[PDB]
């Protein structure tokens, strides 16, 4: 009744979203320099085979079966390659996702917001340079995550170029709270940002995250 | 629009949700940060939801009322009124459809019970932890299974060959190694053998995997779970025409599409037929949820959501709070999460992302929508600021503070005020007093109307200014506007029907509501800072009903009994008691001198006596001989003196007091004479008699004159309290010190330790209680009758002998915080003043009392809520159901040949079932007799010791009850009305005295809840002769039967519980009805042993006895209305064989109709009131009481239609209450002016 | 437990809130060249006190209906 309900409490609270996907990303083993290059070559060969087959599809000349099945097999090889690469590169995405925990947006979505940037990275990766796909994709993961966190983190919309000021305001206010000890003043904030002290007042009123109705007071 | 009938519930199918919606939500944005207008196709957006402000487009093109129905081509919003923002719902198109949580996390899971899964397995399927195979083609997989088994066998042969080859190679390698090296070698042999063993393990695991793949491929069917998904990965590409499978809710949509319901039904029928036991038990819960979809029109397709509806913008509003801050609703966050996740998933489908990412996005989306519909339903809830969970949609329909319990039941109103109440003793019972400013504010339109209808205000605006300035010209008008215009006075908490009363507002100066002194008994309102609300009925109907129903003058008698509540109390009692009390040895007393002098004290008129009393010559209380004319004489005196004619003008001599004459002068011209002191019981009896005999207006005036005279004489009463007026009795100390002498010996034996603590405590408590009673007797004896304390007490005005006992002599014994009595009593009177010890001991009981009474109000409120919610349906629907069935009331105490004391609560104010036949058949009373005191007396004088009365317990009505079977009403004083809501009257009346209920409230609570007793005393299943087996520690009771067979045995019988007092002894005979032990019989036991009617008697007897104990009296029929609402359903063991689950509570009439079979098997059940309001026929009320989601889910899938026959539901929806003045025979009445009146004009 | 102790608890909780920030601060800052006057967080104590008299049930508005009301309060 206590131990059984303890076991039931152990069994019921099972997935928890994060542990459900950590399992999934845990399965497909990560690549090394050769396999990344091979799968990139395979991807771009597949895309080249599709952009080739477009010609023979739209224009004409119904080619013999063997070469067609070969080209289809190269398309499928490209698909397999991009899918296997995307299934490989994920622990990077979660490792970068684990930086932006409790920053308006939920930790769970930021991984997928990372995965979009990852897929764009996979789209626009250049193997000829031979960069390491982590060190390459770091750009796209970050830019995608922070581009999402710019918009969807807040209830009210504020563009990235007008929220970066609020984030950096937060950071440097934390810095000035850390160093000087006390709270700094909008004037000194405007002296730090090099702006009109009537703007930092305007940006704080935006920085007021809205309050609920059904709250026990 | 204005009209309504039966409401029905269902499941919102994606097409129906799309058919609701006006546009699609496809942006996570709320509002623009600069301009604060909502963005296009986001939350709050003006395109789909209509415009924000009244007559405005988004950009700003049309703001005229001229243009109605036109849709601007610039933005695309429709120019209409802003109200539609509360009436317009949105929708969200999901790329992948997700399931609804309600039919999943509910116990049992319904989705799983439709497609026969375990809820954990279903969970795993819907939350993307498993693939499910939707449809397998047995014929197509069977046909070419041979070839696939051949290529399988080849696929095995290959890996067998490779295994053999590698084993051979490693063996050859080993032998070559040994041959090359030839202890150190034997180790390398061991290593080689180990590696061969590893090859063997790899090979056997591969073969096992292949064999298991073929096994799981061969054994394939719909509704099957895959654990690892390597099986499905290998099964995915090969066999691409035989089976299909998806993860999530789309799979469940395809599954519910690939489903014929009648097959599952007819399979279920043979499963419940053949598979009787656990499988029939599991089939039993499936029966209802499956069989619903056949009898109902709605499909099970609507359990999975392709589109999700969006609650209107204003129910989840974003308005800026004072100081620049923004106040939003949590819904916005959840909807934003859902739409964001959706809009990401769409892009994941657009790009062509991998299936794991997409399915994880779908899982997270599922979790988000699940959370949005119900947060904290699955696992950890979503938290925004400071780790507090956000209120989901189902959170806005559940809990104590969501809806129903607070939001739909009670709310603040217009044309309404609240002030401090004060006694206004000048006023007539129908009149009240209003603070003239408060009044001026309360009738602010009604005054303006008259001020512009007259030439006092030139224009309506100017009138609205003049009423604001409160100018001298409005006050002469406010009388003209308030002239016979009723107002509804209400005090929270409203404990009974007379807790609200309508009055005529008189305009008074000051800041106080001048209440009438007679309605304080009803309102339960002491003038010690209590406040009452006033309401202004606006509609002609409301104004009329205020004047007709709830006018104080009409509501004199209690709904509870029919005793007058609007009667002299506290002051008026002492006033009239002094006025009428005849005391000897007074001034101007009638002596009747013997031969020497005249009689001296005779009076020609009451006027002469008033003239004599105005002089300091005659006292108002003396035996005097008036000659009376205007007052109707006593029955005997009329019978003697006049006989033929009455006495309006006829004169007669009395022997009374001027006060009694002055009192009788108040009572009606034709009413006979009293000549008796007005004790509150006698006042109650007279006013009750007057209420029974005369019209209500007459009584309502006579009681007003009684009030006027009462208070006028309450002054000249001479009732004051003083240190000299309160007297300590002389025997107090003599008794106290005589009990101290023995108490000393008790405490001495206790100190010695010869007597136990409990024995000494008991002895001392007994002694000092005896002493307390003695001091009480001394207080009773010593005090003169003219003493003010005796007047305030022994007139019945207030208090009791106990209070004057505590004030004169000794406070007595006083209890610990536990309840056990402290052996040391309070020997000092409150006149004498207490010692620190005595007072400090007194504090306990006072505080405990204050606490328990401070809880009692809330507990009794809670009880009254249940007792109202249970009897929501019991309204008088028709005149007569035409039955001969009735309950049998004794009406007489075994002769005499000895009248019954509780006739007044039992068989008084009741319609009869039969003709009152006697021994011969000299039939005295016929059917349809009110049973008034004359009739009740006549039935006693006839010589019958029983009568069969027609009650609600035996009423054959389709809906509620029929008028004639209820009996006459207590409120009206006539036959109960064909509209009356006798159920909620009964509920209020039974619910009210719980505050005054000081063995107690637990017993009535547990009785009405029908729960197992605190002391389970057994009743006799069979009659027979009792035998005593005096066992060790406990008892054992055996009844030897009359018919012949086995004797009834119970194991452990509690000795401390005590056997029933004819007394229980070894070798007596006891009846079937008789309870064996002294305490409480288990209602279920009594039902199953005897039957419904004896329990119907027992419950009413038991509920009455505890009221009779506390002194309050309610009329049995009010209990019988609730006991009826208890005993009116059946429990089914196993029967029906068509949409009837075994172990299901079923309503009588609906059960009987299908049971009889013109073209089942039920036993009587006794249900608890909560278990009755839980198992009610209605759904939106059942939802309003408790467990909203549970019942509403069932209601939705069942498609269960409520008739709105119950009042409680018809309160929640703002519709005309069907009870009282809301039946079709009332609400539709064509009143034409009569043909003779028309032409006359 | 009286005003002194009821404050002392919030000083304790504030100082415990400070101890973590100190434990981090001395971990991140250089060895010897740190200066505890230089590196010390004032927030978590002043917050712990300000929050005791800000909204907490045991820090009530004085009953100034009269002296006696205050004295009893
Ligand atoms: Mg009071
Ligand atoms: Zn427009
Ligand atoms: Zn009836």
From Swiss-Prot, chain B:
A GO cellular component annotation here is: DNA-directed RNA polymerase complex
The catalytic activity, as recorded, is: RNA(n) + a ribonucleoside 5'-triphosphate = RNA(n+1) + diphosphate
UniProt-annotated binding residues for Mg(2+): 526, 528, 530
Return the Pfam families for the record.
RNA_pol_Rpb1_1, RNA_pol_Rpb1_2, RNA_pol_Rpb1_3, RNA_pol_Rpb1_4, RNA_pol_Rpb1_5
Positions of disulphide bridges? none
| Required co-factors | Mg(2+); Zn(2+)
Alphabetically, the GO molecular function entries are:
DNA binding; DNA-directed RNA polymerase activity; magnesium ion binding; zinc ion binding
Can you tell me which residues bind Zn(2+) 1? 57, 59, 72, 75
Where does the source fall among the domains of life? Bacteria
What does the record note on quaternary structure? The RNAP catalytic core consists of 2 alpha, 1 beta, 1 beta' and 1 omega subunit. When a sigma factor is associated with the core the holoenzyme is formed, which can initiate transcription.
What this chain does, per the entry, is described as: DNA-dependent RNA polymerase catalyzes the transcription of DNA into RNA using the four ribonucleoside triphosphates as substrates.
Q: What NCBIfam families does its record include?
A: PRK14906.1 (NF011498), rpoC_TIGR (TIGR02386)
Q: Which family, according to UniProt?
A: Belongs to the RNA polymerase beta' chain family.
The protein, known as: DNA-directed RNA polymerase subunit beta'
Can you name the source organism? Mycolicibacterium smegmatis (strain ATCC 700084 / mc(2)155) (Mycobacterium smegmatis)
Lineage summary: Bacteria, Bacillati, Actinomycetota, Actinomycetes, Mycobacteriales
UniProtKB/Swiss-Prot annotation, chain C:
- Where does the source fall among the domains of life? Bacteria
Q: Which family does it belong to?
A: Belongs to the RNA polymerase beta chain family.
Subunit details for this protein?
Answer: The RNAP catalytic core consists of 2 alpha, 1 beta, 1 beta' and 1 omega subunit. When a sigma factor is associated with the core the holoenzyme is formed, which can initiate transcription. Interacts with RbpA, which partially restores Rif-inhibited transcription.
Q: What does this protein do?
A: DNA-dependent RNA polymerase catalyzes the transcription of DNA into RNA using the four ribonucleoside triphosphates as substrates. This subunit often mutates to generate rifampicin (Rif) resistance. Interaction with RbpA partially restores Rif-inhibited transcription; once the subunit is Rif-resistant however RbpA no longer stimulates transcription.
Q: Please tell me what else the database record remarks about this protein.
A: Mutations in the RRDR sequence (residues 423-449) confer rifampicin (Rif) resistance. Rif blocks transcription initiation but not elongation.
Protein name, entry field: DNA-directed RNA polymerase subunit beta
According to the record, which residues of the full protein are present here? 370 to 442 of 1169
